[PDB]
Design an enzyme around this catalytic site. Structure first.
Site, mmCIF file in Angstrom:
data_model
loop_
_atom_site.group_PDB
_atom_site.id
_atom_site.type_symbol
_atom_site.label_atom_id
_atom_site.label_comp_id
_atom_site.label_asym_id
_atom_site.label_seq_id
_atom_site.Cartn_x
_atom_site.Cartn_y
_atom_site.Cartn_z
ATOM 1 N N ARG A 178 48.543 32.340 50.737
ATOM 2 C CA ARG A 178 47.830 32.694 52.064
ATOM 3 C C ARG A 178 48.917 32.484 53.248
ATOM 4 O O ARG A 178 48.599 31.997 54.178
ATOM 5 C CB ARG A 178 46.505 31.628 52.349
ATOM 6 C CG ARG A 178 45.475 32.011 51.302
ATOM 7 C CD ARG A 178 45.068 33.515 51.487
ATOM 8 N NE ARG A 178 43.690 33.678 50.505
ATOM 9 C CZ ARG A 178 43.930 33.711 49.185
ATOM 10 N NH1 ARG A 178 44.791 34.097 48.524
ATOM 11 N NH2 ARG A 178 42.627 33.948 48.709
ATOM 12 N N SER B 95 36.695 32.617 52.371
ATOM 13 C CA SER B 95 36.871 31.348 52.294
ATOM 14 C C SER B 95 37.402 30.529 53.665
ATOM 15 O O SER B 95 38.493 30.769 53.761
ATOM 16 C CB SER B 95 38.085 31.161 51.290
ATOM 17 O OG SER B 95 37.640 31.346 50.107
ATOM 18 N N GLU C 15 41.506 28.943 56.339
ATOM 19 C CA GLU C 15 42.533 30.007 56.178
ATOM 20 C C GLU C 15 41.679 31.192 57.365
ATOM 21 O O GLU C 15 42.551 32.123 57.382
ATOM 22 C CB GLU C 15 42.026 30.576 54.874
ATOM 23 C CG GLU C 15 42.671 31.813 54.319
ATOM 24 C CD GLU C 15 41.654 32.562 53.238
ATOM 25 O OE1 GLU C 15 41.513 31.971 52.282
ATOM 26 O OE2 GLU C 15 41.442 33.572 53.414
HETATM 27 C C1 LIG Z 1 33.540 38.451 52.286
HETATM 28 C C2 LIG Z 1 35.026 38.393 52.381
HETATM 29 C C3 LIG Z 1 35.654 38.223 51.195
HETATM 30 C C4 LIG Z 1 37.221 37.814 51.190
HETATM 31 N N1 LIG Z 1 37.870 37.862 50.140
HETATM 32 C C5 LIG Z 1 39.260 37.504 50.307
HETATM 33 C C6 LIG Z 1 39.894 37.174 48.889
HETATM 34 O O1 LIG Z 1 39.425 37.601 47.763
HETATM 35 N N2 LIG Z 1 41.351 37.177 49.067
HETATM 36 C C7 LIG Z 1 42.003 36.898 50.304
HETATM 37 O O2 LIG Z 1 42.988 36.557 50.461
HETATM 38 N N3 LIG Z 1 41.006 37.096 51.376
HETATM 39 C C8 LIG Z 1 39.713 37.396 51.459
HETATM 40 N N4 LIG Z 1 39.091 37.497 52.633
HETATM 41 C C9 LIG Z 1 39.748 37.279 53.724
HETATM 42 C C10 LIG Z 1 40.190 38.746 54.543
HETATM 43 O O3 LIG Z 1 39.726 39.932 53.771
HETATM 44 C C11 LIG Z 1 41.863 38.725 54.711
HETATM 45 O O4 LIG Z 1 42.345 37.786 55.570
HETATM 46 C C12 LIG Z 1 42.389 40.098 54.954
HETATM 47 O O5 LIG Z 1 43.614 40.326 54.793
HETATM 48 C C13 LIG Z 1 41.955 40.390 56.377
HETATM 49 O O6 LIG Z 1 41.853 41.744 56.598
HETATM 50 P P1 LIG Z 1 41.641 42.449 58.194
HETATM 51 O O7 LIG Z 1 42.117 43.658 58.253
HETATM 52 O O8 LIG Z 1 39.903 42.278 58.467
HETATM 53 O O9 LIG Z 1 42.540 41.518 59.305
HETATM 54 P P2 LIG Z 1 41.854 40.946 60.824
HETATM 55 O O10 LIG Z 1 40.688 39.778 60.515
HETATM 56 O O11 LIG Z 1 41.175 41.967 61.448
HETATM 57 O O12 LIG Z 1 42.989 40.327 61.313
HETATM 58 C C14 LIG Z 1 43.735 39.280 60.750
HETATM 59 C C15 LIG Z 1 45.097 38.492 61.472
HETATM 60 O O13 LIG Z 1 46.275 39.575 61.396
HETATM 61 C C16 LIG Z 1 46.435 40.152 62.607
HETATM 62 N N5 LIG Z 1 46.512 41.643 61.997
HETATM 63 C C17 LIG Z 1 45.307 42.180 61.644
HETATM 64 N N6 LIG Z 1 45.920 43.426 61.768
HETATM 65 C C18 LIG Z 1 47.479 43.560 62.144
HETATM 66 C C19 LIG Z 1 48.235 44.519 62.331
HETATM 67 N N7 LIG Z 1 48.404 45.709 62.138
HETATM 68 N N8 LIG Z 1 49.526 44.158 63.132
HETATM 69 C C20 LIG Z 1 49.678 42.742 63.447
HETATM 70 N N9 LIG Z 1 48.818 41.923 63.010
HETATM 71 C C21 LIG Z 1 47.566 42.322 62.407
HETATM 72 C C22 LIG Z 1 45.177 39.909 63.458
HETATM 73 O O14 LIG Z 1 46.013 39.816 64.858
HETATM 74 C C23 LIG Z 1 44.853 38.607 62.930
HETATM 75 O O15 LIG Z 1 45.650 37.105 63.365
HETATM 76 C C24 LIG Z 1 37.555 37.919 52.440
HETATM 77 C C25 LIG Z 1 37.004 38.101 53.563
HETATM 78 C C26 LIG Z 1 35.451 38.381 53.604
HETATM 79 C C27 LIG Z 1 34.753 38.499 54.780
HETATM 80 C C1 LIG Z 2 35.953 35.061 49.624
HETATM 81 C C2 LIG Z 2 37.197 34.633 48.906
HETATM 82 C C3 LIG Z 2 38.633 34.190 49.504
HETATM 83 O O1 LIG Z 2 39.437 34.086 48.422
HETATM 84 C C4 LIG Z 2 39.099 33.278 47.442
HETATM 85 C C5 LIG Z 2 39.378 34.130 45.753
HETATM 86 O O2 LIG Z 2 38.507 35.249 45.618
HETATM 87 C C6 LIG Z 2 39.061 33.209 44.665
HETATM 88 C C7 LIG Z 2 39.391 33.635 43.302
HETATM 89 O O3 LIG Z 2 40.844 33.966 42.996
HETATM 90 O O4 LIG Z 2 39.889 31.971 44.684
HETATM 91 C C8 LIG Z 2 39.436 31.458 45.925
HETATM 92 O O5 LIG Z 2 38.286 30.849 46.116
HETATM 93 P P1 LIG Z 2 38.025 29.875 45.214
HETATM 94 O O6 LIG Z 2 38.968 28.850 45.001
HETATM 95 O O7 LIG Z 2 36.642 28.731 45.578
HETATM 96 O O8 LIG Z 2 37.404 30.658 43.937
HETATM 97 P P2 LIG Z 2 36.566 29.823 42.975
HETATM 98 O O9 LIG Z 2 36.941 30.475 41.375
HETATM 99 O O10 LIG Z 2 35.395 30.443 43.369
HETATM 100 O O11 LIG Z 2 36.294 28.671 42.622
HETATM 101 C C9 LIG Z 2 37.437 27.602 42.246
HETATM 102 C C10 LIG Z 2 36.584 26.356 41.802
HETATM 103 O O12 LIG Z 2 35.850 25.671 42.686
HETATM 104 C C11 LIG Z 2 34.751 25.559 42.246
HETATM 105 N N1 LIG Z 2 33.514 25.603 43.146
HETATM 106 C C12 LIG Z 2 33.772 26.568 44.216
HETATM 107 C C13 LIG Z 2 32.700 26.770 45.071
HETATM 108 C C14 LIG Z 2 31.684 25.773 44.872
HETATM 109 O O13 LIG Z 2 30.721 25.965 45.766
HETATM 110 N N2 LIG Z 2 31.558 24.822 43.973
HETATM 111 C C15 LIG Z 2 32.434 24.704 42.923
HETATM 112 O O14 LIG Z 2 32.312 24.124 41.830
HETATM 113 C C16 LIG Z 2 34.659 26.560 41.144
HETATM 114 O O15 LIG Z 2 33.580 26.577 40.033
HETATM 115 C C17 LIG Z 2 36.052 26.600 40.636
HETATM 116 O O16 LIG Z 2 36.195 25.928 39.289
HETATM 117 C C18 LIG Z 2 39.967 32.160 47.214
HETATM 118 N N3 LIG Z 2 40.690 31.222 48.035
HETATM 119 C C19 LIG Z 2 41.769 30.718 48.450
HETATM 120 C C20 LIG Z 2 41.494 29.790 49.740
HETATM 121 O O17 LIG Z 2 42.551 30.373 48.073
HETATM 122 C C21 LIG Z 2 39.163 34.542 50.871
HETATM 123 O O18 LIG Z 2 40.280 33.972 51.091
HETATM 124 O O19 LIG Z 2 38.548 34.792 51.790
#
Ligand SMILES: Cc1cc2nc3c(=O)[nH]c(=O)nc-3n(C[C@H](O)[C@H](O)[C@H](O)COP(=O)(O)OP(=O)(O)OC[C@H]3O[C@@H](n4cnc5c(N)ncnc54)[C@H](O)[C@@H]3O)c2cc1C
Ligand SMILES: CCC(O[C@H]1[C@H](O)[C@@H](CO)O[C@H](OP(=O)(O)OP(=O)(O)OC[C@H]2O[C@@H](n3ccc(=O)[nH]c3=O)[C@H](O)[C@@H]2O)[C@@H]1NC(C)=O)C(=O)O
Length: 340
Positions: free
Chosen positions: A157, A227, A323
């Site tokens: 991240r 997250s 994050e």
């Molecule tokens: C339901 C949900 C699930 C998610 N699952 C994951 C996951 O599985 N793994 C994971 O890693 N993340 C996850 N995220 C987090 C999120 O999707 C990421 O951080 C993603 O990369 C943000 O995309 P965004 O376009 O919405 O950025 P924004 O929120 O719009 O911006 C993010 C940051 O980057 C900057 N930025 C944005 N666009 C630009 C640009 N063109 N130039 C310069 N800076 C820019 C902004 O100024 C800000 O500081 C999840 C979020 C949600 C709501």
């Molecule tokens: C929305 C998701 C997200 O990113 C997420 C990504 O999809 C996922 C799979 O690779 O691993 C992260 O979550 P996370 O580590 O919780 O993924 P999980 O597999 O759900 O759980 C890890 C461990 O935590 C345990 N867990 C998690 C939540 C909870 O309420 N209870 C619990 O016990 C799980 O069972 C597991 O053994 C990401 N986060 C980070 C900060 O590295 C994000 O960044 O926004």
């Protein structure tokens, strides 16, 4: 003008100007204009990683620069994708088009330009794996730049865009390298049940989306920024100590002895699932996600995070780092400071 459509958390605060840049010159114009008026500029893809703390004193640019370009090499399909592109629709398209390699990163929200910024990762894969380069505009000078994935300095991240390059540059395009020789990443959770030779890319996509859909909240239903905290990395000793009293703690060891822990498990262990402060709650199916359960104000989200972080810090003496990006009036502030 209201920021509420522009951030998946559904937080209602205001900006002096909000503007959609649908090409690079446009973005550059909007930036030059607001900074010439003494205003701060914030670029957003979908706002799925930002928490607005206050009303914003400057201009918010919504990056909507689109278009996909596919260049053929014997070894790999190379894609030149516009920043304003929606990432999940790119994953779907690439698979539809017979170019697999993005399926583990399925259903992650946001735009493609934002995917290098926090090295998007889920289910065994981070963006660093299929990222070739990232293209930016030097906002302060018009100077167009290209970084290789190496120069991107990808971390858990993390990337250079969270440091040296943050408000200095705007990303306009990301270069993706997908190997023509498909290779399934079946190392994470329920993916280990899939066999490496029978499995099609679409079954991994479905397998990943099912795990996501069962635990993660829809921002369409309740706003969230995914997250809220990073998974903590602790010392070999502190991980062994917590795992002595807490044997069943999910932990992910590094080569260098240190251990990553699950922050969602630790929050869960403090019995915080369903916990509310005002309109914001800890999501019951995945305690690492804070949500906008009912007309949440940004101060409620900050207080619930301060509460969850104090609780885990007292129970486990592991201190959780967010994050989500905290945006205060004049630009980004320190999130840990705001929830301390
Ligand atoms: C339901 C949900 C699930 C998610 N699952 C994951 C996951 O599985 N793994 C994971 O890693 N993340 C996850 N995220 C987090 C999120 O999707 C990421 O951080 C993603 O990369 C943000 O995309 P965004 O376009 O919405 O950025 P924004 O929120 O719009 O911006 C993010 C940051 O980057 C900057 N930025 C944005 N666009 C630009 C640009 N063109 N130039 C310069 N800076 C820019 C902004 O100024 C800000 O500081 C999840 C979020 C949600 C709501
Ligand atoms: C929305 C998701 C997200 O990113 C997420 C990504 O999809 C996922 C799979 O690779 O691993 C992260 O979550 P996370 O580590 O919780 O993924 P999980 O597999 O759900 O759980 C890890 C461990 O935590 C345990 N867990 C998690 C939540 C909870 O309420 N209870 C619990 O016990 C799980 O069972 C597991 O053994 C990401 N986060 C980070 C900060 O590295 C994000 O960044 O926004």
């Amino acid at each position: 003008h209201s920021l509420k459509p522009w951030n998946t958390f559904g937080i209602d605060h205001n900006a002096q100007h909000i503007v959609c840049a649908e090409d690079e010159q446009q973005l550059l114009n909007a930036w030059q204009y607001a900074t010439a008026e003494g205003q701060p500029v914030l670029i957003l893809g979908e706002g799925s990683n930002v928490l607005f703390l206050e009303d914003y004193r400057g201009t918010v640019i919504i990056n909507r620069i689109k278009g996909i370009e596919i260049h053929d090499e014997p070894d790999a399909w190379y894609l030149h994708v516009g920043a304003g592109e929606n990432w999940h629709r790119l994953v779907k398209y690439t698979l539809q088009e017979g170019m697999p390699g993005l399926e583990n990163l399925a259903l992650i929200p946001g735009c493609v330009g934002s995917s290098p910024i926090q090295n998007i990762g889920a289910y065994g894969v981070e963006l660093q794996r299929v990222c070739a380069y990232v293209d930016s505009v030097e906002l302060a000078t018009g100077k167009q730049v290209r970084l290789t994935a190496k120069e991107c300095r990808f971390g858990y991240r993390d990337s250079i865009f969270k440091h040296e390059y943050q408000d200095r540059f705007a990303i306009v395009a990301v270069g993706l390298r997908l190997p023509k020789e498909w290779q399934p990443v079946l190392t994470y959770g329920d993916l280990t049940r899939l066999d490496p030779t029978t499995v099609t890319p679409q079954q991994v996509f479905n397998a990943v989306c099912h795990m996501r859909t069962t635990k993660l909240p829809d921002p369409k239903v309740n706003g969230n920024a995914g997250s809220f905290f990073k998974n903590p990395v602790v010392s070999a000793e502190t991980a062994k100590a917590l795992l002595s009293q807490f044997p069943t703690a999910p932990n992910y060891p590094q080569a260098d002895g240190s251990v990553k822990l699950a922050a969602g498990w630790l929050i869960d262990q403090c019995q915080l699932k369903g916990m509310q402060i005002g309109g914001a709650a800890v999501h019951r199916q995945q305690a690492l996600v804070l949500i906008n359960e009912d007309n949440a104000k940004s101060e409620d989200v900050v207080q619930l995070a301060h509460h969850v972080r104090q609780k885990v810090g007292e129970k486990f003496n592991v201190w959780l780092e967010p994050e989500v990006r905290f945006i205060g009036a004049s630009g980004e502030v320190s999130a840990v400071e705001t929830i301390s």
